[PDB]
Amino acid sequence: DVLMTQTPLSLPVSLGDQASISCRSSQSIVHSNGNTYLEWYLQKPGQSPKLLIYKVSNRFSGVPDRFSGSGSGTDFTLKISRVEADDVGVYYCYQGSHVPYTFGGGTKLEI
Amino acid sequence: GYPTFGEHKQEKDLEYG
Amino acid sequence: EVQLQQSGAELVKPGASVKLSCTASGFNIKDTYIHWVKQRPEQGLEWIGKIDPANGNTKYDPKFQDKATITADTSSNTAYLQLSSLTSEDTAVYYCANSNYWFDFDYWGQGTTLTVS
Numbered sequence: 735d736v737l738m739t740q741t742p743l744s745l746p747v748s749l750g751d752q753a754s755i756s757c758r759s760s761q762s763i764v765h766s767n768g769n770t771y772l773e774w775y776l777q778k779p780g781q782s783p784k785l786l787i788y789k790v791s792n793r794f795s796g797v798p799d800r801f802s803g804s805g806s807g808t809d810f811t812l813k814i815s816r817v818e819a820d821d822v823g824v825y826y827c828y829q830g831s832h833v834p835y836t837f838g839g840g841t842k843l844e845i
Numbered sequence: 846g847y848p849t850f851g852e853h854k855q856e857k858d859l860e861y862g
Numbered sequence: 863e864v865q866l867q868q869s870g871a872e873l874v875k876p877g878a879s880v881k882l883s884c885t886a887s888g889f890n891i892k893d894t895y896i897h898w899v900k901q902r903p904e905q906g907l908e909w910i911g912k913i914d915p916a917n918g919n920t921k922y923d924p925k926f927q928d929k930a931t932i933t934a935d936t937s938s939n940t941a942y943l944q945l946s947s948l949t950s951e952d953t954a955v956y957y958c959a960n961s962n963y964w965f966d967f968d969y970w971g972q973g974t975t976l977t978v979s
Binding site for chain 1: 866899906907908909921922923924957959962964965966967968969970971972973
């Protein structure tokens, strides 16, 4: 059971600002393949989660380049270069390396 | 081929060959 | 691309068995994961299990296992989360996520609210 937490739990930013959400797991989430498969999902109020970032720094098709992850080991970072009102919502940090798979604590990104 | 038995889903497609 | 069309909100009583439906659209349901992810108001997001309808194969979080029985109507393309013998923990929103042609999963359902009076 790998516990993924996030800080802060709520991140107030301005329009067009750069957000940095700090996530940390309890154990290394490096896959046995040698790759790190860390995903970030955006869930908006009344909506289901949607994939924005996968494999740490890979961007899902249709996702603005404003989104990018970073970090390594247990300490990872969700970077968003251009946070708009359309980027408002709760971000989750999900690891698909250890069964059972686990999600992050959740950070509300808001303007 | 694949190096292991099991379902060969998208995630484990990097192991083809 | 990927569309997951879930059932709406249902309002039930405990000691019932309720199968929540997650309809695939735009894909055959045997080339991908069906995951169920639970979210109570008092929880974040909690992976239940997965079913690959293709050869019946399931993998579980032991905690919710055998409170949740995961099945699938294979040819009708609709996966089903059979939440059996309910307690207070079944009062939750369920999300149904679909395997990503990359390495994880792309797009999530619409939410099936199971409220237990």
